[PDB]
Amino acid sequence: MHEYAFFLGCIAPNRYPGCEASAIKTSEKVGIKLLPLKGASCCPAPGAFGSIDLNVWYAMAARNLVLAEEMKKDIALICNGCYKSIWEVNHILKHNDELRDNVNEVLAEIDMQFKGTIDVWHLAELYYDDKVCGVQKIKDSVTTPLSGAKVAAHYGCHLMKPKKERHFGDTENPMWFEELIGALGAEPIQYRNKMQCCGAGGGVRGYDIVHALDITNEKLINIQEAGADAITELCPFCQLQFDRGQIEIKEKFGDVYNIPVLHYNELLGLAQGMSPQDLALDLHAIDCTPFLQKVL
């Protein structure tokens, strides 16, 4: 049973707690142990806080990293934006000496040092790796087939891009996340421009809601045209956009889709037999009941 510190940023615990609950339960069912991070905070959200000040972005991400450093554990994440912040600041401060120095003399005011000893992983990346739980182990753990459901994957942008800074391979047409959805028994479908941004990154969600919603609506149109019955995602930002933004699209525009948006951990819980009440699917703006009728 591999053990990881569970970073747990802002949106999953405070808006979609079923995501974190299913994360812990399903990760324990497969051979992974997710340990609470002691006093972790907002990973300085890369858009809304990196746009303001890169130095304080570095300092806060480094503080989050040195918490798990003192814990002597590897970070595990469930958010693409949190992955950007944590993993990328870890990578930058493992190689840039003057930035290490600057962050360290900022952190020395709170009796705290960064040395760069741990690694950062996304939970879906762990589920895909073969040393850690693999696709076959996921298939083994699945107990409810979830058959006869068309499911559209949204990769997001901060997990895989830029490919010159990550290690997940092709960004033009990846299929790895489609294999994790196929392990659950749901057939993943392909839609036009599947690698498009959801529109919520960089603080655009806050600065220009209509612009962000138009970017989201382009995706929703493509997904409905494909014929999806739900949208899996690996990011609480993207889930919030696809969930709230459907309501804001219904009100600001006149478009109705009613497409449930679920984190992959929530689908994994559904596959492994967790209850909809135990997943808190009532906390989503868009009702999941048609999808539950199909897969149950």
Partner 1 sequence: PRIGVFVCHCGTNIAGSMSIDDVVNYAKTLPYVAVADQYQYMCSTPGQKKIDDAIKEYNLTGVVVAACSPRLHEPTFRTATKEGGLNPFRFEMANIREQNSWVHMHGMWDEATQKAKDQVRMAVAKAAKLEDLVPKSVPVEKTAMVVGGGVAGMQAALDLASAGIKTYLIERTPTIGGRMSQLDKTFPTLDCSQCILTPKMVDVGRHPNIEMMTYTEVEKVEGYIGNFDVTLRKKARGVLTPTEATAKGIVGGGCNGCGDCSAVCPVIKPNPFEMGMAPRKAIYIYHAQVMPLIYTVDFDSCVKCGLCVEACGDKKAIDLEMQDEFITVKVGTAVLATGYELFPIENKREWGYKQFDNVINALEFERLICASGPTGGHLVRPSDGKTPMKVGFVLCAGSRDNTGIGKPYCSRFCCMYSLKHAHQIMEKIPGAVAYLFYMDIRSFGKMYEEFYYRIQHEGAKFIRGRVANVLEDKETKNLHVFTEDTLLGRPVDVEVDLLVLAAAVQPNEGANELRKKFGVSASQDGWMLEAHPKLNPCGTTTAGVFLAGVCQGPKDIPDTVAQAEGAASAASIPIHMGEVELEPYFAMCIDELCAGCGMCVNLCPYSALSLGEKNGRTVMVVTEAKCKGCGTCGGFCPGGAIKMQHFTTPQIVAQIDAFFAG
Partner 2 sequence: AFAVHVNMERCTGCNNCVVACPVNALELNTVNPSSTDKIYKVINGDAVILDVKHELCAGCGICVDACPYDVIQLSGQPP
CA–CA distance, 222 with 192 (Å, rounded to integer): 6
Q: How far is CA 187 from the centre of its chain?
A: 21
Work out what residue 172 binds among partner 1, partner 2, none; the CB cut-off runs from 5 to 8 Å by kind: partner 1
Tell me the Cα Rg of the chain: 19
Work out what residue 141 binds among partner 1, partner 2, none; the CB cut-off runs from 5 to 8 Å by kind: partner 2
Least CB distance from residue 141 to partner 2, whole Å? 6
> Which of 172, 251 has the CB closer to partner 1?
172
Indicate which single residue of 173, 254, 277, 293 sits in contact with partner 1 (rule: CB under 8 A): 173
Report how far apart, in Å, the C-alpha atoms of 120 and of each of 44, 61, 100, 128, 159 are: 16, 12, 18, 15, 12
CA–CA distance, 235 with 156 (Å, rounded to integer): 7
> Which of 147, 190 has the CB closer to partner 2?
147
Report how far apart, in Å, the C-alpha atoms of 138 and of each of 85, 130, 210, 214, 230 are: 28, 11, 39, 36, 20
Is 111 a binder of partner 1 (CB under 8 A)?
no
Work out what residue 117 binds among partner 2, partner 1, none; the CB cut-off runs from 5 to 8 Å by kind: none
Q: Which two three-digit tokens encode residue 133?
A: 């739980």
> Which of 29, 154 has the CB closer to partner 2?
29
- For the residues of 139-185, what is the DSSP string, one character each? HHH--S---S-EEEEE--STTT--TTT-SS--SSS--HHHHHHHHTT
Is 192 a binder of partner 1 (CB under 8 A)?
yes
DSSP assignment, residue 109?
Answer: G
Is 293 a binder of partner 1 (CB under 8 A)?
no
Is 167 a binder of partner 1 (CB under 8 A)?
no
> Which of 21, 142 has the CB closer to partner 2?
142
Angle at the Cα of 216 (from 212 to 218), degrees rounded to 5? 120
Contact 76, 121 (CB under 8 A): yes
Q: For the CA atoms of 52, 55, 61, 63, what is the dihedral angle to 10 degrees?
A: -130
Work out what residue 136 binds among partner 2, partner 1, none; the CB cut-off runs from 5 to 8 Å by kind: partner 2
Contact residues: partner 2, CB under 8 A: 29, 136-137, 140-141
Q: Which stretch binds partner 1 (CB under 8 A): 85-93, 170-178, 203-211, 281-289?
A: 170-178
Q: For the CA atoms of 138, 142, 147, 149, what is the dihedral angle to 10 degrees?
A: -60
Q: Which stretch binds partner 1 (CB under 8 A): 52-60, 190-198, 241-249, 277-285?
A: 190-198
Q: Which stretch binds partner 1 (CB under 8 A): 2-10, 135-143, 145-153, 187-195?
A: 187-195
Is 143 a binder of partner 1 (CB under 8 A)?
no
Work out what residue 192 binds among partner 1, partner 2, none; the CB cut-off runs from 5 to 8 Å by kind: partner 1
> Which of 80, 141 has the CB closer to partner 2?
141
Indicate which single residue of 172, 251, 254, 277 sits in contact with partner 1 (rule: CB under 8 A): 172
3-state DSSP call for residue 211? helix
Residues in touch with partner 1 (CB under 8 A):
164, 170-173, 190, 192-193
